[PDB]
Amino acid sequence: GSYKKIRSNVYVDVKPLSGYEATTCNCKKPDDDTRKGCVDDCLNRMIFAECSPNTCPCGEQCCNQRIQRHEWVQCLERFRAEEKGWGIRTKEPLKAGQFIIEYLGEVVSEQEFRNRMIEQYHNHSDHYCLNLDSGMVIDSYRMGNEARFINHSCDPNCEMQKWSVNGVYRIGLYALKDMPAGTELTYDYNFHSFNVELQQLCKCGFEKCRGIIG
Ligand SMILES: C[S@@+](CC[C@H](N)C(=O)[O-])C[C@H]1O[C@@H](n2cnc3c(N)ncnc32)[C@H](O)[C@@H]1O
Ligand SMILES: [Zn+2]
Ligand SMILES: [Zn+2]
Ligand SMILES: [Zn+2]
């Protein structure tokens, strides 16, 4: 699979404004340099907002700015996944709830995407897209990052979380459970993949596999 690598979303014909900014939290700055801020009941984190750095009381210690500062894990690797094409796995262990990577691509309207589905994406045997917000999709058929190669599983070890970052909705991949070196990342497409009849057979090999994707 060939594609165009990007470092941040390309906004084609829509603007996915969250319609709320993040607004100053009551977290305390730890005195220890190497101790992280905004972990617990960050007001922002509470509602899935990243802190704005012009106002976080924790400055460079805030850990609620992961998407903003592109704090992706460095240990990912692409590989051939039996009966699934290509996939992604981690090289070192990951921890429950740890931020992994942003899902990137072209941010398009409901209709634009339907149009792409007709005039280009018809003949495809792999699909690369995620729902964003209210008839807007992230289309990574052409552009994205390594997140486009993460396979579906009816029993996922990762999840897509919609975040509000500086007034804009974006999607980060987060671990659901602990994972050791060599584990393939998977998430559940059903909850997130746009529904315009992209029925495909599932091969996750989960004992209770739903059998289809969508
Ligand atoms: C977002 S891409 C993942 C990367 C893809 N395997 C590749 O080689 O480029 C999703 C496509 O991979 C395939 N796929 C992903 N997970 C699968 C699974 N659990 N079972 C069968 N096919 C899967 C499907 O064909 C789907 O359209
Ligand atoms: Zn905070
Ligand atoms: Zn903060
Ligand atoms: Zn399955």
Side-chain angles (χ1 to χ4, degrees):
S2 157
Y3 74 104
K4 304 179 209 152
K5 174 153 264 220
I6 45 178
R7 300 183 222 87
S8 73
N9 288 340
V10 179
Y11 297 85
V12 179
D13 73 319
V14 285
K15 299 185 179 166
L17 295 185
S18 68
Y20 65 94
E21 268 92 73
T23 304
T24 322
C25 77
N26 309 292
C27 300
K28 299 302 149 185
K29 202 158 187 171
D31 291 316
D32 213 26
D33 284 310
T34 65
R35 197 170 141 208
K36 284 303 166 194
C38 294
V39 169
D40 53 8
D41 286 306
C42 190
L43 280 207
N44 280 341
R45 205 179 273 271
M46 150 185 293
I47 54 159
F48 291 88
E50 291 201 344
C51 288
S52 165
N54 315 319
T55 92
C56 196
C58 308
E60 305 316 82
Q61 278 157 96
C62 190
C63 73
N64 190 31
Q65 294 182 31
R66 295 248 185 230
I67 284 161
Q68 263 167 312
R69 303 167 183 175
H70 325 256
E71 288 164 22
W72 309 348
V73 81
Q74 295 308 291
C75 53
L76 301 177
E77 177 204 342
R78 197 194 305 165
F79 72 99
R80 204 129 58 196
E82 200 212 315
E83 301 199 301
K84 290 186 278 161
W86 294 79
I88 297 288
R89 64 187 166 201
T90 168
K91 278 184 287 161
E92 87 204 11
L94 314 174
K95 306 154 72 155
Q98 154 175 18
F99 174 75
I100 301 147
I101 189 178
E102 189 181 0
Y103 197 84
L104 298 190
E106 299 185 61
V107 175
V108 300
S109 69
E110 189 166 357
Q111 197 41 236
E112 176 62 39
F113 186 79
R114 259 185 216 109
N115 291 351
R116 280 165 185 216
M117 200 62 207
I118 290 159
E119 315 196 324
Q120 281 160 299
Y121 302 159
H122 54 276
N123 191 60
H124 283 68
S125 46
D126 293 288
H127 310 291
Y128 305 88
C129 59
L130 266 197
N131 264 102
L132 189 53
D133 188 64
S134 62
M136 282 176 211
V137 169
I138 301 170
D139 168 10
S140 65
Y141 282 81
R142 282 142 41 105
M143 318 183 82
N145 63 350
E146 289 280 283
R148 70 200 287 292
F149 293 107
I150 306 178
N151 295 309
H152 162 96
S153 173
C154 304
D155 180 46
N157 55 27
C158 294
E159 76 174 329
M160 293 298 170
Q161 277 171 31
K162 186 172 70 183
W163 279 73
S164 196
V165 168
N166 187 49
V168 180
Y169 277 135
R170 307 213 229 152
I171 289 161
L173 182 84
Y174 294 74
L176 278 171
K177 57 183 87 170
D178 276 12
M179 280 167 277
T183 323
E184 170 180 6
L185 309 195
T186 62
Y187 70 94
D188 206 314
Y189 290 16
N190 296 317
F191 289 79
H192 316 107
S193 266
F194 203 62
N195 233 138
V196 295
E197 312 307 315
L198 329 173
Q199 308 278 274
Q200 283 183 116
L201 282 166
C202 174
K203 317 269 193 161
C204 55
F206 182 51
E207 320 164 308
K208 307 174 287 288
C209 167
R210 269 193 285 290
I212 315 161
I213 309 154

